[PDB]
Design an enzyme around this catalytic site. Structure first.
Site, PDB file in Angstrom:
ATOM      1  N   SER A 105       1.282  -0.566  -0.077  1.00 55.95           N
ATOM      2  CA  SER A 105      -0.247   0.151  -0.195  1.00 55.95           C
ATOM      3  C   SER A 105       0.746   1.083   0.040  1.00 55.95           C
ATOM      4  O   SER A 105       1.794   1.197  -0.806  1.00 55.95           O
ATOM      5  CB  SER A 105      -1.343   0.075   1.449  1.00 55.95           C
ATOM      6  OG  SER A 105      -2.109   0.474   1.164  1.00 55.95           O
ATOM      7  N   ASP A 244      -8.969  -4.881  -5.354  1.00 54.89           N
ATOM      8  CA  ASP A 244      -8.258  -3.913  -4.000  1.00 54.89           C
ATOM      9  C   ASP A 244      -8.184  -2.722  -4.176  1.00 54.89           C
ATOM     10  O   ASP A 244      -8.582  -1.502  -5.348  1.00 54.89           O
ATOM     11  CB  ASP A 244      -6.838  -3.935  -5.129  1.00 54.89           C
ATOM     12  CG  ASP A 244      -5.581  -3.830  -4.536  1.00 54.89           C
ATOM     13  OD1 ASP A 244      -4.753  -3.875  -4.230  1.00 54.89           O
ATOM     14  OD2 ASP A 244      -6.070  -2.782  -3.391  1.00 54.89           O
ATOM     15  N   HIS A 271      -6.688  -6.022  -1.003  1.00 57.04           N
ATOM     16  CA  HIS A 271      -6.061  -5.065  -1.180  1.00 57.04           C
ATOM     17  C   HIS A 271      -4.061  -5.616  -0.690  1.00 57.04           C
ATOM     18  O   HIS A 271      -3.863  -5.863  -0.668  1.00 57.04           O
ATOM     19  CB  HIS A 271      -6.172  -4.000   0.272  1.00 57.04           C
ATOM     20  CG  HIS A 271      -5.262  -2.884   0.088  1.00 57.04           C
ATOM     21  ND1 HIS A 271      -4.836  -2.462  -0.653  1.00 57.04           N
ATOM     22  CD2 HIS A 271      -4.711  -2.186   1.753  1.00 57.04           C
ATOM     23  CE1 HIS A 271      -3.389  -1.570  -0.493  1.00 57.04           C
ATOM     24  NE2 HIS A 271      -4.084  -1.223   0.334  1.00 57.04           N
TER      25      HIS A 271
HETATM   26  C1  LIG Z   1      -2.856   1.587   2.496  1.00 53.17           C
HETATM   27  O1  LIG Z   1      -1.300   1.918   3.025  1.00 53.17           O
HETATM   28  C2  LIG Z   1      -3.249   1.026   3.275  1.00 53.17           C
HETATM   29 CL1  LIG Z   1      -2.872  -0.553   3.866  1.00 53.17          CL
HETATM   30  C3  LIG Z   1      -3.187   2.637   1.454  1.00 53.17           C
HETATM   31  N1  LIG Z   1      -3.945   3.278   2.888  1.00 53.17           N
HETATM   32  C4  LIG Z   1      -2.700   3.343   0.951  1.00 53.17           C
HETATM   33  C5  LIG Z   1      -3.897   4.836  -0.133  1.00 53.17           C
HETATM   34  C6  LIG Z   1      -4.886   4.357  -0.751  1.00 53.17           C
HETATM   35  C7  LIG Z   1      -5.474   5.191  -1.192  1.00 53.17           C
HETATM   36  C8  LIG Z   1      -4.929   6.831  -1.028  1.00 53.17           C
HETATM   37  C9  LIG Z   1      -4.406   6.751  -0.725  1.00 53.17           C
HETATM   38  C10 LIG Z   1      -3.198   5.792   0.404  1.00 53.17           C
END
Ligand SMILES: *[C@](O)(CCl)[C@@H](N)Cc1ccccc1
Length: 293
Positions: A105, A244, A271
């Site tokens: 992520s 995802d 995800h």
């Molecule tokens: C991941 O870091 C989750 Cl484990 C995710 N929050 C990253 C993200 C997704 C969508 C927009 C910004 C950051």
């Protein structure tokens, strides 16, 4: 089989960071992992721990202001700082060895920002459910919002539009979203819950990300390095789920830029592909590391 890990609380380039290394038997390659968030913890990535019996050493560590590590100055809440933190750790720990980098992520995005500068220290890169552009991922998530049934789709565009996140209906829609695009399961693992818990207790997720996964108003809402990741020449394994939250379309962009990079989409997955298909996920990241040994 597993043989526990060596936990420590060392001083990196300025702050105290927590890390947990698990190495041997028959170590073949070393691997560093970067959790997502921002503002989460290594906890939810502890499934990757199974790769040690496959000769893979894993370095789990909570980034700045995350998990069990101290929060630095508010200005140090950037991705460029995480990269300086990662390199400092890899060095003052592994010396000058070439290590495999694994980002999940936000960690994936960070992992990329890393390669853009210190790729020569890496033997391989793994970007799972990551992104190179936030605005892009945002655009992709909005579609998902519209694809959700009105019962929740409306709630997300209403209460999420008036700053009413404490609303049960809205919080109900956020949950449906998470059980669909964040992690597809009814029996969520403790490791994840702890990282999520860490996200609500610290300040990183708040100041960099925002209220939730699909409502980013933090300090990365404009981050985008697509026109930079093309310079990465090391072996790259890019994975992403079918449902995802950070669509395989966003994973596609990264694929283009990185020459020779692989791209694998996990059907029936979202995800956190670590727990949806642990054996298959690890197997994929394991063979990847072993071939590029
Ligand atoms: C991941 O870091 C989750 Cl484990 C995710 N929050 C990253 C993200 C997704 C969508 C927009 C910004 C950051």
């Amino acid at each position: 089989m597993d043989q526990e890990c060596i936990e420590n609380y060392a001083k990196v380039n300025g702050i105290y960071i927590y890390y947990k290394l698990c190495k041997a038997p028959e170590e073949k390659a070393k691997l560093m992992t970067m959790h997502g968030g921002p503002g989460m913890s290594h906890d939810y990535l502890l499934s990757l721990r199974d790769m040690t019996k496959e000769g893979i050493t894993v370095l789990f560590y909570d980034q700045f202001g995350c998990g069990r590590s101290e929060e630095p100055d508010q200005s140090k809440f950037t991705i460029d700082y995480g990269v300086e933190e990662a390199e400092a750790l890899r060095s003052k720990l592994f010396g000058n060895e070439k290590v495999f980098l694994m980002g999940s992520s936000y960690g994936g995005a960070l992992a990329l920002a890393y390669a853009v500068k210190y790729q020569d220290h890496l033997k391989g890169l793994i970007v799972s459910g990551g992104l190179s552009s936030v605005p892009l991922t945002v655009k992709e998530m909005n579609r998902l919002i519209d694809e959700l049934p009105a019962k929740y789709r409306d709630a997300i565009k209403k209460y999420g539009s008036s700053g009413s996140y404490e609303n049960p209906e809205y919080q109900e829609a956020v949950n449906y979203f998470y059980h669909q695009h964040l992690l597809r399961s009814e029996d969520w693992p403790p490791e994840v819950l702890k990282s999520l818990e860490y996200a609500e207790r610290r300040n990183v997720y708040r100041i960099m990300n925002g209220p939730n996964e699909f409502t980013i108003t933090g300090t990365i809402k404009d981050w985008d390095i697509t026109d930079k990741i093309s310079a990465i020449k090391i072996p790259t394994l890019i994975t992403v789920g079918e449902y995802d939250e950070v669509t395989p379309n966003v994973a596609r962009v990264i694929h283009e830029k990185i020459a020779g990079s692989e791209l694998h989409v996990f059907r029936d997955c979202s995800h956190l592909t670590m727990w949806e298909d642990r054996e298959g996920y690890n197997k994929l990241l394991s063979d990847f590391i072993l071939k590029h040994l």
